[PDB]
Amino acid sequence: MERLQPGVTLTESIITMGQQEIPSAVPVFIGYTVRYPEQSEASVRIDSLAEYTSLFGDDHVMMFAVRHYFDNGGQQAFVLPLKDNMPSVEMTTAEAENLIAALRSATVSEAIGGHSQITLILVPDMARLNDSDIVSLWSQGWEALLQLSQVRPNLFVLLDAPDNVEQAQKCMTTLSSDYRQWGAAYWPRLETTYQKIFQGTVLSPTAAVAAVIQRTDNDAGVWKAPANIALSQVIRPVKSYLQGSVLFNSSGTSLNVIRSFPGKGIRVWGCRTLENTDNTQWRYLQTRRLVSYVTAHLTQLARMYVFEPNNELTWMKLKGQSYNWLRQLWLQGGLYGSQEDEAFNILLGVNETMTEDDVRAGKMIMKVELAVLFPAEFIEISLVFNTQTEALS
Amino acid sequence: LIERGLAKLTINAYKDREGKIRAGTLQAMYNPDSLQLDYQTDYQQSQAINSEKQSSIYVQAKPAGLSLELIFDATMPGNKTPIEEQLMQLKQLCSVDATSNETRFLQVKWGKMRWESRGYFAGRAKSLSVNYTLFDRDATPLRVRVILALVADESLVLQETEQNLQSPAKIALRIQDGVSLALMAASTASTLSGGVDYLTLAWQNGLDNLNGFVPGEILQATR
Amino acid sequence: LIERGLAKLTINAYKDREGKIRAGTLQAMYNPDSLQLDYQTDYQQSQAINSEKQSSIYVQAKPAGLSLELIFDATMPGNKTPIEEQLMQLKQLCSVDATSNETRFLQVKWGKMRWESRGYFAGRAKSLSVNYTLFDRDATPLRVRVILALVADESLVLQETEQNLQSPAKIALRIQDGVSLALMAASTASTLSGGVDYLTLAWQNGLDNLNGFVPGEILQATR
Amino acid sequence: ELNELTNKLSNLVPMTDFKLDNRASLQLLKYIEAYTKIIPFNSGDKYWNDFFFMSGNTPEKLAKLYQKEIEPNGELLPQQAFLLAVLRLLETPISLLNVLPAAHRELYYRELLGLSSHAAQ
Amino acid sequence: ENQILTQLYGRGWAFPPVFSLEKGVEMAEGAEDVRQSLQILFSTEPGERLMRENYGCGLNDFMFENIRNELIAEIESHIHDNVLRYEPRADMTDIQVRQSPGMGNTLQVQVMYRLRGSDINQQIQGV
Amino acid sequence: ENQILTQLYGRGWAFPPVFSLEKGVEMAEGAEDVRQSLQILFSTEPGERLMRENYGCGLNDFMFENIRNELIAEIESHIHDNVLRYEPRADMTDIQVRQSPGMGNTLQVQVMYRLRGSDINQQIQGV
Amino acid sequence: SYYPVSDTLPPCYGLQHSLSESEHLLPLHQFMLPFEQLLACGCQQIAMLPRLLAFQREGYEVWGDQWPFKSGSVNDDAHQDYAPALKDLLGQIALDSDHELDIINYLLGYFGTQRAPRTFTTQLDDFRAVQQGYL
């Protein structure tokens, strides 16, 4: 065991795993940390927990969400810490307002809106106010979060629901924000297998769902719904499944539930946004994430020829490059069409979308319409008897 | 009809014949061009000193054999999964399972292709032929042409219940207008392995008479 | 990634199966163009007088066979090692070792090519086919086209410990939320060669009750 | 009383005369009759004891069918033959419970009190 | 609604297990046992029967996946070899899987079956 | 840090062999014996055990050779079939070999392993 | 501890469902009640075995009368209208206290002596504690 002489000396330092860099699913964890030592940047990228514990301290509620995010299969994540003090063991009502006023602050809105790599946000610190908070305090936190997902194009928010069933139905009805389609609420708190197996630590569910959103993005694309996939380190939802059967409403606002199937694991059950279905098109989570995937990949094509002469030539180079990409997304099973004129359509001409003054003002107007798919959440068996039509051979 | 997207070949390995334990999957990079299914039956011709009738008896129906080829690639810019990862996944399906001391049971399936009235091709791998070409100068292979050869091993609890719907133990028959009991007991021989005699058909139904049935009545023919 | 240089084929001959004694190496002049690995398994179909279920049993898994060709040359100005030196080195690997009275154990390896989850291809030479062409007028050969054919002979102390990680003697299981003991003892049959009975699983863990486990508890299932 | 197990069980333990449960099968069905006559068959004056003992079947007759004093006829009501199938199962926890005071005594003499038995002379 | 089809398929308990003051438990007779034997199988999921661990249609393990022609062809394959294992008395004859015209997310399966050994229509609806 | 994993892997002496006045020699229990059984193997080189001549990772016979993709792929092959022979209780699951960003000469190997028969995480660090 | 048989049934029978959502829930949930109390008597009497075979006996009480369901359970909520009546007929076990005098005759037989014969001037309540302290 000579550590300076050349040879094979084993070390305790953990080096990083080879990252796969999934581009369209990467979360932030905005919460209170104990250390806060980073002095260069605003929001920093972590890769492992052993890199996080050296970089943001130990033994807090936001660490066990990162520790459970790296167990379910997530490989990269950002952490934007709140600069205020870490709260008590239970959250007082004088202190719980200090969190939601820090979520409306521009100190955390500029770090998210300036980085332009993050595609979904989440607070694991909202379940810290689940005890001794007092109902509208939850809705004051959700309306802060859904507003935070409006600073820039591709942002989503996974958010925690209150465990009490009366409090959940009230915060579903009395939300009343005009940006409800950017959120999704997963109801029960998970009892993970971390100490204090006998008293496993009760945990936010959204840290596990952000890893399986990233996990179903790796193989089946953004068009696949993130429900019905197993969760790794959890024992049980702390509330029963049958107690939360009133959380799903097919006509009102429906809240996603986490079910326990015997022999099949703990599973996410439901891919619904917060939505009141008056002919709405952004009803499911996968429809909102697909249509925001084709904005954030058509802006990367339309950025390439900003400051171009705006003649009839540079529209046919835009109508050709975006038609060729949407067909490439359609032939992956993404857009619900039997032929390409049924799946999508684009128009760009000087007499179709824009006027003669909009060319003089210097703007192109592209009109992309696209069809999407449905997730098959209900299945109905009919069971009819058919010796009527055997027809005597 | 509904959508337009490639269905791809998946080979699911099961540890048991019934399909209850799962051993791992492998989705193909590119689908095979062609799928060849080969059936075969053995017939032995009976020799006899007296007669010269040409009549060949049935010996055995050999199991089906599916033969498909695949290609794996890492040259192209679109694909980045290495071929060491996929060929390790493929050889672990044509492998002696340490739990059951046999090979594993594969289920090839893709799309709406029924493999003669099964959605999958249940069977085990009889052969496997990797042909590495076009290595990098790091000696990582960039093209691999596997040739799989399977032989059909289907579950027994599925084949137990196809025999019961083809030749059941009990039949119910609807009479129609002046077919005799001698004529109706010949129609039982279509699906009762030698029909019931016209007396033993009348005894089982409790017939008062050999012609004592109305044309609306339902008869029962058990064996 | 790091560098850019040819990895070349090396065949290391070992006197024993485990790989402890070394008998000599041979690095190839030019690498093979293609590497063909051929696997094969034998299945016998069970005949029975009563039933007609198609079910083929497993007999034997034949060992793998690697088939590569090499070329050796001395015409060109770049290369100066004679082919008598290299063909004497190659035939001494496909040779009866006088210490062990068998042939020697070869380990073909080059670069990052895994030969289905081994860095080398452990096996002995089954055939060898030298084809001399283009001699000098001194009758020194200047081109030689060897065709090697190997058959896989892998070490036994490696294959003893792959069976133990695939089907261990003792299992520990984490319970999760209202799976019964009748349901959990079926999940042991995935990796215990016939699962423990739901009573003999409860006796080994010392269960006070058949449902007397908390969902956090770890059960143990030995055989 | 369950002759399939109690041959194997009586050979290991001494199995003295005293039983912790003298509950006979005729005695059990009178206990389940007074139980079911409290449970209300819904929106009716009649109770659940009219269900479990429906048509010409008293608990004295069902004990006769169970102990085979009467030959078992092919037609019995299914909720009654469900009930007689339960009492065939419950002979197994009862028979292992009657064998325990014979094992409690032998534990007292040999383990605690240390007494031995005389060998052959 | 005759006594003949009872002799081929037997009498069993009706799946809505409603008990009556006369005749005891309501018995599902011969042609109606085999329909209700399909209603029990589609309604249970595998793992929640007590000791018969693998009994019930697992349509739960592929839902919340998008409706395409590859999901529909996986339902008709799964719903075919499951009725073969757990329903020996009913032979399937056609499966029609299509999504409903009203609500686009839900898709409706329709299983057409004949009983084995018998070609006898039911006269009208009942039991 | 339970008594269950001791029953699968046993108790042995800790590799830093530090002796205490209470409890005697510090015992490496079940999940921590298998980690320390890997630390003994990487730390000894073959030939310096007394009678077990070939025991220990020979990474000494290929060092002072230049870092390329052919040396890295020879480490991952050597470090894989050596844990198979001398560690029956730990199955390897990934090897990551890369040279460090700070000093270019040294390269750092990282062995990821699971224990056989059991999927039980360690709760926190210790022993 | 006793875990109910109505838990292990498949959830389409509705025993762990919300109460009286459908009308077929209640006649089923009363059918499982007599076969639950027969199994709940078997779980009590093993837990009574240190009490049933102790040498320092003090009780009338034999085989058992405890309700099978915990008070928070949904199975308790179905029969909540007649749980006071069912518990009181479960208190028929005090009428079976003659059996307790047959165990004291068995437990005294370890030490060679039988129990006392029953007389006519017993005062059977006060007679029995003399027979208990004798053991």
From TrEMBL, chain A:
Ranges for domain Tail sheath protein C-terminal: 278-383
Could you tell me the superkingdom of the organism this chain comes from? Answer: Bacteria
The record ties this protein, via InterPro entries, to: Tail_sheath_C, Tail_sheath_structural
The family assignment reads:
Belongs to the myoviridae tail sheath protein family.
- Official protein name in the record: Tail sheath protein C-terminal domain-containing protein
Organism listed in the record = Photorhabdus asymbiotica subsp. asymbiotica (strain ATCC 43949 / 3105-77)
TrEMBL record, chain D:
Entry protein name: Baseplate protein J-like domain-containing protein
Which residues of the parent protein does this chain contain?
Answer: 2 to 122 of 728
From TrEMBL, chains E, F:
Known Gene3D superfamilies for this protein? Answer: 3.10.450.40
Q: Which Pfam families match?
A: GPW_gp25
The organism's superkingdom is given as Bacteria
**Domain (IraD/Gp25-like): residue spans on this chain:** 29-118
Descriptive protein name: Phage baseplate assembly protein
Q: Species name for this entry?
A: Photorhabdus asymbiotica subsp. asymbiotica (strain ATCC 43949 / 3105-77)
Q: Give the source lineage, highest ranks first.
A: Bacteria, Pseudomonadati, Pseudomonadota, Gammaproteobacteria, Enterobacterales
TrEMBL record, chain G:
Annotated protein name in UniProt: Uncharacterized protein
Q: Which organism is it from?
A: Photorhabdus asymbiotica subsp. asymbiotica (strain ATCC 43949 / 3105-77) (Xenorhabdus luminescens (strain 2))
Which domain of life does the protein's organism represent?
A: Bacteria
User: What stretch of the parent protein is included here?
Assistant: 409 to 543 of 950
